[PDB]
Design an enzyme around this catalytic site. Structure first.
Site, PDB file in Angstrom:
ATOM      1  N   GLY A  51       0.776  -1.227   0.000  1.00 48.26           N
ATOM      2  CA  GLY A  51       0.000   0.000   0.000  1.00 48.26           C
ATOM      3  C   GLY A  51       0.813   1.285   0.000  1.00 48.26           C
ATOM      4  N   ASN A  52       1.958   1.275   0.678  1.00 50.28           N
ATOM      5  CA  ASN A  52       2.806   2.464   0.768  1.00 50.28           C
ATOM      6  C   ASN A  52       3.394   2.921  -0.564  1.00 50.28           C
ATOM      7  OD1 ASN A  52       4.605   0.068   0.974  1.00 50.28           O
ATOM      8  ND2 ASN A  52       6.224   1.593   1.282  1.00 50.28           N
TER       9      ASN A  52
ATOM     10  N   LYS B 114       2.710 -12.817   3.750  1.00 52.07           N
ATOM     11  CA  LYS B 114       4.000 -12.550   3.129  1.00 52.07           C
ATOM     12  C   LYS B 114       4.997 -13.661   3.461  1.00 52.07           C
ATOM     13  CE  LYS B 114       3.441  -7.526   2.937  1.00 52.07           C
ATOM     14  NZ  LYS B 114       1.973  -7.721   2.838  1.00 52.07           N
TER      15      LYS B 114
ATOM     16  N   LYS C 258     -13.293 -11.454   4.193  1.00 53.41           N
ATOM     17  CA  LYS C 258     -12.629 -10.228   3.767  1.00 53.41           C
ATOM     18  C   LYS C 258     -13.668  -9.132   3.540  1.00 53.41           C
ATOM     19  CE  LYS C 258      -9.070  -7.793   2.713  1.00 53.41           C
ATOM     20  NZ  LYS C 258      -8.521  -7.842   1.329  1.00 53.41           N
TER      21      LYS C 258
ATOM     22  N   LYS D  95      -2.503 -10.673  -2.709  1.00 51.00           N
ATOM     23  CA  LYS D  95      -1.500 -10.280  -3.694  1.00 51.00           C
ATOM     24  C   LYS D  95      -0.131 -10.915  -3.478  1.00 51.00           C
ATOM     25  CE  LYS D  95       1.139  -7.075  -1.338  1.00 51.00           C
ATOM     26  NZ  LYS D  95       2.609  -6.875  -1.396  1.00 51.00           N
TER      27      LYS D  95
END
Lengths: 313, 312
Positions: free
Chosen positions: A10-11, A275, A128, A213
């Protein structure tokens, strides 16, 4: 000229506070493109992926804000939209940066679908949240009419929750590979990809769901035979006892060791968990290292000199 | 042989600007089945399309949120329609090709078009976009954003935006590369995302829309395509509405159409741009351009149906 799949967070796309305003994003993307340009300068070829949380949420809210008689586009169309929205921002900014450095190259944005399994537990247990807050009456109606599933929000109202099935294959892998052969920077698998399922007869059908993602990027790296999987986030890497007393940031760790920590809930399911899972999967399926690090330190991360390197065994 | 095929609204949405996923999926399936026949016939193709109803829907939705929520610029909405319509076309075309024995992927190219900031259209916008607003809402939107509106016969108000002439297709090379790899490529959706050149090499997105047919004609010339095809609802160009004579021109020299155009036979809001686009392709490349119906696409591509524009 090795290949690396770089998963942005997001950053890299949106401003502090999740601001999807054209202003905020353009500034964030400029920062990310500059850093990516450095990586390309070091000789790497890349396939850049990214998330789409705030963006797809914004679109969902926008369509729901329309008068009841207007149609709302399904989530998979919203996801496709975000691939062009975020993809174009990254594409335009990166091309401009490379040009400023004397490099004239075009960056393609590949509209990307991801195959998921209809038997995935997530389809029966969606969790979600996506979109705006729904009122009781409207939510009960949507459940009766479209079979939508909701979760009560403690602050009031309900959130529509959709499935987040695990990625099985990248439907558009070949287009991504072809794009990579032609350009050192390719943007793809935006938001984790558009989910589709195989119906009887070989027919692919889009479904309303989201795909992580990072898990998707890991699968893509494996299917592209990438030399490295890179996950760029807003922290220096993976840490045990994160945000707690015995906190320690790992510089290198065997996938087998991280897998143990993962099963014990050391990594929040909403952030670092996926991740770590993605990194481990890449190592297990390809036998090559994966690295998780900071977007800021990307240049070093790619060289395996920063962040957490997940090693074989 | 390479053909640039410009699809119209009837290929993507339903009558009355019906943009529901059900209606668009059905419309696209019909169009894709026909396109698949064209490809099966030996043609390679770059497929373009408009986005009027779709980009309008997006603007309508963004403005439906509380005023303080971020509003995306038109250039981003245009890009979104490229993935929206592109995904639908890509998905259905792949399915249709597969059934015919061709197992191929169809790429969707996010495309930008270069325009000139000095274009007369920027200060005299006339291209209607977005939903129909009321008088009070419209004037309020003008004060809020500086938007310009056009009132229709029914008293409705629609925002009008610049529609400058396309200068070059920025992503031409990506489209050419995709075409080398696949017989079906979707690109230049909605006429393209417009940008202008600023100090240096910098490309600046601008608030405007580009005519999809004019942009498609330019793309066809830059790709050195063998044929420019404009598919619409009518069988061809009509100049005679009397009971006698041919209904639609079967073929006509560029100079002949140009004369009709200069007389006002083709409304700028419909057939005008398509005729201009066909004329341009023929004059610039010397190859034929054809304006016909989506239904008869197979005969059109072969120049046995539709209005065939020739050099002269």
């Amino acid at each position: 000229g090795r290949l690396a799949v770089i998963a942005l967070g997001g950053n890299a796309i949106a401003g502090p506070g999740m601001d999807v305003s054209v202003e905020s994003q353009t500034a964030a993307v400029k920062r990310a493109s500059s850093i990516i340009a450095d990586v390309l300068a070091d000789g790497w070829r890349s396939v850049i992926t990214h998330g789409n949380g705030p963006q797809v949420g914004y679109l969902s809210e926008a369509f729901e804000a329309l008068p009841p008689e207007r149609p709302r586009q399904p989530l998979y169309i919203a996801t496709a939209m975000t691939q062009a929205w975020i993809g174009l921002l990254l594409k335009h900014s990166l091309e401009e940066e490379l040009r400023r450095r004397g490099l004239n190259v075009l960056v393609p944005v590949v509209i990307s679908r991801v195959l998921v399994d209809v038997s995935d537990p997530s389809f029966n247990n969606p969790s979600k949240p996506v979109g705006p807050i729904y009122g009781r009456e409207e939510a009960e109606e949507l459940s009766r009419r479209y079979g939508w599933v909701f979760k009560r929000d403690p602050r009031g109202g309900f959130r529509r929750v959709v499935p987040s099935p695990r990625p099985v294959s990248i439907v558009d892998r070949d287009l991504i590979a072809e794009a990579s052969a032609e350009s050192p920077a390719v943007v793809a698998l935006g938001g984790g990809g558009v989910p589709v399922v195989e119906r009887p007869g070989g027919v692919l059908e889009p479904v309303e769901a989201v795909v992580d993602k990072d898990l998707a990027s890991s699968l893509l790296a494996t299917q592209l035979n990438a030399d490295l999987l890179v996950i760029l986030t807003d922290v220096p890497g993976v840490a045990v006892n994160y945000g707690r007393e015995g906190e320690r940031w790992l510089r290198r760790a065997a996938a087998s060791e991280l897998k143990k920590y993962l099963r014990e809930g050391h990594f929040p399911p909403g952030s670092m968990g996926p991740k770590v899972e993605a990194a481990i999967s890449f190592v297990e399926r390809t036998g090559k290292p994966a690295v998780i690090g900071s977007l800021e330190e990307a240049r070093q991360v790619l060289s395996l000199q920063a962040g957490t390197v997940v090693m074989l065994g």
